């Protein structure tokens, strides 16, 4: 929910960022699933079903899933996310 | 309900 957004900065580990990005075909948006215990997403404060709003300050709400994946995969050693829960 | 998933 945009009424309570969350900022999270992830430091990439040996297994990447330690989460799955999921999307539902036909519905807008991407969301966090399968946060790995003790991994970067966990330590950064991400929770299951968080929806990604911005990647490194870029609004991704209207971008296709494959583009959001590519932004995160291309970020380098860290990435900053604006997300919101529910 | 087709779900896309990517490990990151």
């Amino acid at each position: 929910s945009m009424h309570k957004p969350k900022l999270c900065r992830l430091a990439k580990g040996e297994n990447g960022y330690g989460f799955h990005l999921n999307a539902i075909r036909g519905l807008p948006g991407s969301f966090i699933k399968e946060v790995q215990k003790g991994g970067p997403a966990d330590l950064a404060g991400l929770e299951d079903e968080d929806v990604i709003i911005e990647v490194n300050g870029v609004n991704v709400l209207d971008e296709p899933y494959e583009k959001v994946v590519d932004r995160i995969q291309s970020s380098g050693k860290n990435v900053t996310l604006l997300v919101c829960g529910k | 309900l087709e779900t896309k998933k990517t490990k990151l």
Side-chain angles (χ1 to χ4, degrees), chain A residues 1-2 5-13 15-24 26-46 48-85, chain B residues 3-8:
Chain A
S1 155
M2 237 105 126
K6 180 169 51 178
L7 284 163
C8 306
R9 180 185 183 280
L10 289 70
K12 199 160 74 180
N15 194 221
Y17 290 116
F19 71 99
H20 276 59
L21 192 69
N22 287 17
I24 293 166
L27 296 181
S30 54
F31 49 94
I32 313 293
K33 298 296 278 179
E34 302 186 27
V35 174
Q36 291 159 223
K37 176 180 179 188
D42 182 5
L43 303 182
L46 292 179
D48 201 73
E49 300 277 354
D50 284 352
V51 179
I52 299 190
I53 303 164
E54 296 187 336
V55 179
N56 292 336
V58 179
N59 176 13
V60 299
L61 289 176
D62 288 316
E63 283 184 354
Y65 170 77
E66 296 75 16
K67 172 72 166 172
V68 183
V69 169
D70 189 75
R71 290 187 180 280
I72 298 164
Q73 289 177 335
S74 305
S75 181
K77 298 194 185 177
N78 55 72
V79 65
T80 296
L81 306 178
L82 179 68
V83 312
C84 68
Chain B
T3 303
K4 308 170 183 186
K5 305 184 183 182
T6 303
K7 182 187 298 179
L8 292 175

